[PDB]
Design a protein around this ligand. Structure first.
Ligand SMILES: Cc1cc2nc3c(=O)[nH]c(=O)nc-3n(C[C@H](O)[C@H](O)[C@H](O)COP(=O)(O)O)c2cc1C
Ligand code: SF4
Ligand code: SF4
Ligand code: SF4
Ligand code: SF4
Ligand code: SF4
Ligand code: FES
Ligand code: FES
Lengths: 120, 156, 227, 439, 226, 139
């Protein structure tokens, strides 16, 4: 959701991202880059992620010929599935209305009562 | 589009004559509009605002604050059944069940023809004769579930 | 005037209330509904301290410090256990209907409600029921509206009406369905409507222009400039 | 049941056919003699002193003395614009005394407002009446028209030069409008948020002017004091609360009604000798002395006098002295759930503990009703009761809301403990994340 | 010498708080090894500020008890909101601690001016001429504010303001377009009726597209319907 | 009283011994959560305080630590002596199973302390590091 919590929780400052919004109103990263030449693989960004988007995976073979190629953009980080946390969906809990999920349709949410309604 | 009638404006101004501040006639102005038109439409807030010289946000806050100022379209008759403690002791739940069976609605909404609308209301001040129910201008006491069809048939 | 906060003597101005006098001394009292420019109305009940009649008093009484004058020889306690528990309870009651919205909220990292939730030490939720929701209005090109995040502190209406002289913003509804906004969708008419983004202690009124290219407050580079 | 004027000052002129008494019949039955004596033989300060010395306390539920409240008015002659308000709202559940007082004796209320307006030097008077009392509104408007027709209201009343105009402001159906500062706010056409004190309404009330708000019953005892004398009023009963009071038991009893009794009358006398006891095959369980905003009392407290101080030490309030009886058939969890649903939907939304803690108690009581209670719920209710007391909330609606809840927990805890059937569960398991198994 | 006070508006670039500069960004400023990593993985040199006492980094002071008047942003631990300005003041709602920034250039003179005897005559509505009444807009009269793209939706469509009597004299209604020429520039605007305007005047929105603010008090020719 | 509670450690016998030897106004006791008695000693009494602790019946035989601190930006120094800089000496008595911190305040211009190398030979590298990282001279 491009909330920038992983970027600030990073002690090396090797995560850069920008928030963008679609037409329905959901937040997403416009870009997302991790400088893996700086990253110490400490797992603080995964610990700080409130959506379980960023994850540290069992893969150690990341050697490169050029240091510029260790800067991983969003196309090199976004995988096809949920990774280590299979069922969590932040937008099923958040209060913002997005496509397919209106007001009062999140977890533990009542339908919105208009102030003009006849009931006291 | 909402135009105030001449009689409504005259009654509103006569109510403004009773107070030293024109804002004090907002509740009675909303009640006058509701009595004339069944409820208070969206343009009525702006019309009362221009008549009284107070902002429309104030009139909207007053209209949405009070329960008896209707800001949604209702039916031609309003059932107001008392859900308070003494009528609960005297069994208002059977009266509510009979009303839900006859009208075939839930409380708060209107019938398909707009003939009745059902509302749980506050204590009517008739607790010694409970349970009580308020139709548009008439209070009814000593209610029984069997008397609901014979009581509701006199309101068309 | 002379006050005694937690057994420590302080010299303050007697014309101020207790909350602003204690905040001027560096003491931390949580507060929502009070503003230095708007005055005190005692709505949010967050600024509660324990006041004693004299030095040799043990029972005391909870008072709102924003509504209590800082009179001479006034004995109070902020770190009293009862006052701390009541302030935590007020934050918890505000937290019962609050949306799970902080990652996708523009007030995150700049939120007074976040700061006071942390300051009260309230981090365990024992409320298991549903939370109320609200539709949002379109307030124009400048102010974005998110009514779910409201805590009903009445700062917006007090500022916009009693201070700014605006007419189109107000409070509607009742008991726990209080709505803060315009009667219909439309642009906020006041020329000072933008100060709502700093008056509102939550994410209800946000800078839409900033919300386009949003970044958190810790990520900004700031400078003191002149408009 | 005979009703002499010496011992039933408010109900002796009532008619047996339940018809209202108009101006000619009211004047026939010793009407507007106290008003004539007050306006032609007493200074306003003298009338205030007589009301103060008569021990006339308030009848709305607070029990504050009327003379002390009237003595808070400013002594400056520069502020001659003053208002007298009659709290005819009667929005508290279990209360039906003002409906009887205004639907059948409107001229008594008119005379009391006239006397109190002369005593307070009040130039205008308003009757804040609820919108459901249509018959009371019609009777009060007809009585006002008859009073100005006979010269009892308007300009130059009784030739004394005193001007007083009385209006009837019908409410729009909200319970919080009965609160005096919220009554002032709703009279000004605003949202009925109550105000903070100090300043009191006597210093600056309606439209910033000195304003005194009094109940219907207090302004009904005022003409009896001003006509029959002060030493007659102090000698009605041998109790600290002088004068009579409209008391009565309601709810599944043999004779649910309203009678006029002196203070110090025990609650068992009202239940047995007047209400006839409970109905057939019903075991008495509990009773509320003063409506929905008062603590429940058991049958052991039934042998207690109906005074403010006597019910105060019992752990309750006298309130409006209109008691409601609960038998054994009623589940107390359901009754307190209905009470809290009323008190949570009648919140004004101004202040946090009432607005956001009454619905939490409502949902907890709903869960206890359906047997879906969880551990910590009764502890949450007790925390809500102790954190919604006086001073914690902005007005007195929330202490009166939590009084029946704490009283029912104190006396009937086994019914609340019987709704807890499920283990506590606030979180659902998230796959891949091991929970913190707190002990 | 009339601008001699601007030396004291802010201290010079050698101003330090216990030897360190004033920070421009908060302590938890993030992404310092990745914001420019798409351009080059090598971190660039930190921009040096020789002009002022501030630094383009977090390596500086923003303590609320620091002896200074220029505060870039308010942040205290536990107070991340705009309520941290309470921590940055001596008393809340008062002045900034150690004084507010800015210095008055001139003091109040001991002796005043004389009464201006040049009393103007009344406004005379002359036929053919049209006095331009300025109509300023908060969103649209400032040039750089007009350049802001978010103001284009907030700013109104340019309406030429006319008296009802003058609009009846020209026969133009509310909303129709009239064309007027000033300095040989015939431009067209739609008419809005202004009842409060005085007859003989025509209202023009200042600062807008083509309507320079130097038209205040300027005469106008050839006001005709397009 | 939990283990993390702020203690002043005035009941430590070393505080009473220091009071009986140097007087009650010779030093200031600071309440901390360090778990040790923290004692602000005047600079001119530092060598004799260290010698007195070295000659105790159950003496403080080990210099556990010695380092500086820049206190110019420290805002919450209530109850602390005025100091632009400070030097702390952590000493351990193994026989007592106790430890004490001694703090010497230093002004910004007068950044020099007497050397501790005579009492404890391991103070050499600590004083070299304190000079290196803080500019505090050791005479
Ligand atoms: C929530 C609430 C509701 C109240 N409703 C009424 C009411 O309906 N009628 C009434 O006379 N007093 C009501 N009161 C009491 C008033 O605040 C006030 O004490 C009373 O109207 C006048 O005082 P009196 O008894 O001396 O006449 C209410 C108080 C509260 C807190
Ligand atoms: S694992 Fe890498 S990217 Fe994540 S916080 Fe640690 S250093 Fe930063
Ligand atoms: S990866 Fe997680 S922590 Fe980082 S911006 Fe996205 S949602 Fe926030
Ligand atoms: S307003 Fe504050 S507490 Fe609420 S979602 Fe936004 S950041 Fe979180
Ligand atoms: S919208 Fe914001 S300022 Fe207004 S009451 Fe709600 S939290 Fe307070
Ligand atoms: S307790 Fe608070 S929210 Fe409730 S009715 Fe009173 S002022 Fe309003
Ligand atoms: S409880 Fe129903 S009329 Fe009072
Ligand atoms: S800050 Fe005092 S009650 Fe809100």
């Amino acid at each position: 959701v491009a909330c920038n919590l992983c970027a600030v929780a990073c002690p090396v400052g090797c995560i850069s991202l920008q928030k963008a919004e679609t037409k329905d109103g959901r937040w997403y990263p416009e870009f997302f880059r991790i400088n893996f030449s700086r990253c110490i693989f400490c797992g603080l960004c995964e610990e700080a992620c409130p959506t379980t988007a960023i994850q540290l995976t069992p893969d150690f073979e990341m050697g490169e010929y050029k240091r510029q190629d260790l800067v991983y953009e969003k196309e090199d980080l976004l995988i096809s599935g949920p990774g280590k946390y299979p069922e969590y969906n932040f937008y099923r809990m958040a209060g913002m209305a997005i496509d397919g999920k209106d007001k009062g349709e999140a977890e533990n949410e009542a339908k919105p009562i208009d102030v003009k309604s006849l009931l006291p | 589009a909402f135009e105030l009638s001449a009689a409504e404006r005259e009654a509103i101004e006569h109510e403004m004559h009773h107070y030293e501040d024109p804002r004090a006639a907002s509740i009675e102005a909303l009640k006058i509009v509701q009595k004339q038109r069944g409820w208070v439409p969206d343009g009525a807030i702006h019309a009362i605002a221009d008549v009284l010289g107070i902002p429309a946000s104030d009139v909207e806050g007053v209209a949405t604050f009070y329960s008896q100022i209707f800001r949604q379209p209702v039916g031609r008759h309003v059932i107001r059944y008392c859900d308070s403690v003494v009528c609960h002791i005297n069994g208002y739940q059977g009266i509510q069940a009979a009303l839900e069976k006859k009208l075939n609605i839930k409380p708060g909404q209107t019938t398909f023809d707009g003939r009745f609308t059902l509302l749980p209301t506050c204590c009517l001040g008739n607790c010694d004769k409970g349970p009580n129910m308020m139709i548009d201008e008439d209070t009814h006491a000593h209610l029984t579930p069997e008397a609901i069809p014979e009581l509701l048939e006199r309101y068309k | 005037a002379t006050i005694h906060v937690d057994g420590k003597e302080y010299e303050v101005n007697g014309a101020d209330n207790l909350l602003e006098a204690c905040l001027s001394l560096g003491l931390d009292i949580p507060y929502f509904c009070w503003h230095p420019a708007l005055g005190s109305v005692g709505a949010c009940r967050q600024c509660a301290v324990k006041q004693y009649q004299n030095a040799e008093d043990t029972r005391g009484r909870l008072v709102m410090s924003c509504m209590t004058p800082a009179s001479d020889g006034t004995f109070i306690s902020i770190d009293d256990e009862e006052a701390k528990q009541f302030r935590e309870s007020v934050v918890e009651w505000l937290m019962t209907n609050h949306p799970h919205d902080c990652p996708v909220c523009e007030e995150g990292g700049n939120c007074h409600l976040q700061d006071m939730t942390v300051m009260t030490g309230h981090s365990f939720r024992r409320y298991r029921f549903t939370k109320r929701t609200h539709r949002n209005q379109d307030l124009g090109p400048f102010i974005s509206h998110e009514m779910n995040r409201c805590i009903a502190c009445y700062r917006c209406v007090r500022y916009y009406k009693d201070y700014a002289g605006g007419t189109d913003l107000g409070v509607y509804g009742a008991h726990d369905n209080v709505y803060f906004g315009r009667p219909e969708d439309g642009t906020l008419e006041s020329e000072f409507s933008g100060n709502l983004v700093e008056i509102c202690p939550t994410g209800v009124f946000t800078d839409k222009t900033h919300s386009e290219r949003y970044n958190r407050k810790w990520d900004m580079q700031f400078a003191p400039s002149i408009c | 049941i005979i009703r002499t004027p010496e011992t039933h000052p408010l109900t002796w002129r009532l008619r047996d056919d339940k018809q209202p008494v108009w101006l000619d019949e009211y004047r026939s039955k010793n009407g507007y003699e106290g008003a004539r004596k007050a306006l032609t033989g007493l200074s306003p300060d003298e009338i205030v002193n007589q009301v103060k010395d008569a021990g006339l306390k308030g009848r709305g539920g607070a029990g504050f003395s009327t003379g002390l409240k009237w003595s808070l008015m400013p002594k400056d002659e520069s502020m001659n614009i003053r208002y007298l308000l009659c709290n005819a709202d009667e929005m508290e559940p279990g209360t039906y005394k003002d409906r009887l007082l205004m639907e059948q004796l409107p001229h008594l209320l008119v005379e009391g407002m006239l006397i109190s307006a002369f005593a307070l030097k009040a130039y205008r008077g308003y009757i804040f009446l609820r919108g459901e009392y249509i018959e009371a509104a019609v009777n009060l408007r007809r009585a006002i028209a008859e009073a100005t027709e006979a010269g009892l209201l308007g300009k130059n009343i009784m030739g004394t030069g005193f001007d007083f105009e009385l209006f009837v402001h019908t409410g729009a159906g909200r319970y919080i409008c009965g609160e005096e500062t919220a009554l002032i706010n709703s009279l000004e056409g605003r949202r009925a948020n109550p105000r903070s004190k100090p300043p009191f309404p006597a210093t600056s009330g309606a439209w910033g002017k000195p304003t005194c708000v009094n109940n219907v019953e207090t302004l009904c005892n005022v003409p009896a004091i001003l006509a029959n004398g002060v030493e007659w009023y102090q000698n009605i009963s041998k109790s600290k609360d002088a004068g009579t009071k409209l008391m009565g038991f309601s709810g599944r009893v043999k004779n649910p009604g309203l009678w006029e009794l002196p203070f110090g009358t025990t609650a068992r006398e009202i239940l047995e000798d007047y209400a006839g006891g409970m109905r057939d095959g019903l075991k008495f369980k509990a009773w509320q002395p003063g409506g929905a905003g008062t603590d429940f009392l058991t049958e052991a407290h039934l042998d207690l006098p109906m005074e403010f101080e006597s019910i105060g030490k019992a752990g309750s309030r006298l309130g409006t002295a209109l008691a409601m009886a609960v038998d054994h058939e009623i589940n107390m969890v359901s009754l307190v759930r209905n009470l809290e649903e009323f008190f949570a939907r009648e919140s004004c939304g101004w202040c946090t503990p009432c607005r956001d803690g009454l619905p939490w108690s409502v949902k907890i009581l709903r869960a206890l009703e359906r047997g879906e209670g969880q551990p910590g719920d009764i502890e949450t209710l007790e925390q809500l009761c102790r954190f919604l007391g006086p001073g914690k909330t902005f007005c007195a609606h929330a202490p009166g809301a939590v009084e029946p809840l704490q009283s029912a927990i104190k006396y009937f805890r086994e019914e609340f403990e019987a709704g807890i059937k499920q283990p506590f569960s606030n979180t659902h398991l998230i796959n891949g994340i091991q929970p913190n198994l707190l002990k | 010498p009339e601008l001699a006070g601007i030396k004291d508006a802010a201290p010079d670039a050698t101003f330090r708080i216990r030897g360190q500069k004033l920070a421009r960004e908060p302590h938890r400023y993030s992404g310092r090894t990745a914001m420019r990593a798409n351009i080059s993985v090598h971190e660039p040199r930190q921009p040096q500020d020789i002009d002022t006492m501030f630094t383009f980094s977090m390596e500086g002071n923003n303590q609320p008890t620091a002896h200074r008047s220029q505060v870039p942003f308010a942040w205290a631990p536990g107070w991340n909101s705009p309520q941290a300005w309470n921590k940055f003041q001596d008393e809340v709602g008062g002045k900034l601690r150690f004084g507010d920034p800015g210095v008055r250039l001139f003091e109040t003179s001991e002796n005043g001016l004389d009464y201006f005897t040049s009393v103007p005559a009344r406004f005379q509505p002359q036929d053919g001429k049209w006095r331009i009444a300025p109509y300023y807009h908060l969103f649209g009269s400032d040039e750089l504010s007009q350049r802001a793209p978010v103001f284009q939706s907030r700013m109104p469509q340019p309406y030429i303001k006319l008296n009802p009597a003058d609009a009846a004299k020209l026969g133009v209604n509310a909303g129709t377009r009239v064309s007027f020429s000033y300095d040989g520039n015939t431009v067209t605007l739609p008419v809005e009726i202004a009842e409060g305007l005085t007859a003989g005047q025509v209202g023009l929105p200042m600062g807008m597209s083509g309507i320079a603010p130097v038209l205040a008090g300027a005469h106008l020719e050839d006001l005709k319907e397009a | 009283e939990p283990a993390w509670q702020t203690r002043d450690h005035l009941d430590d016998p070393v505080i009473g011994e220091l009071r009986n030897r140097f007087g009650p106004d010779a030093f200031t006791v600071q309440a901390t959560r360090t778990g040790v008695p923290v004692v602000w000693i005047k600079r001119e009494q530092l060598l004799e305080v260290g010698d007195f602790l070295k000659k105790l019946p159950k003496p403080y035989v080990m210099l556990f630590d010695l380092h500086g601190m820049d206190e110019r930006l420290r805002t919450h120094r209530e109850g602390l002596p005025a100091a632009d800089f400070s030097v702390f000496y952590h000493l351990i008595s193994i026989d007592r199973n106790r430890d004490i911190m001694l703090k010497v305040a230093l002004a910004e211009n007068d950044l020099h302390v007497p050397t501790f190398t005579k009492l404890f030979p391991n103070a050499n590298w600590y004083e070299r590091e304190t000079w290196d990282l803080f500019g505090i001279t050791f005479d």
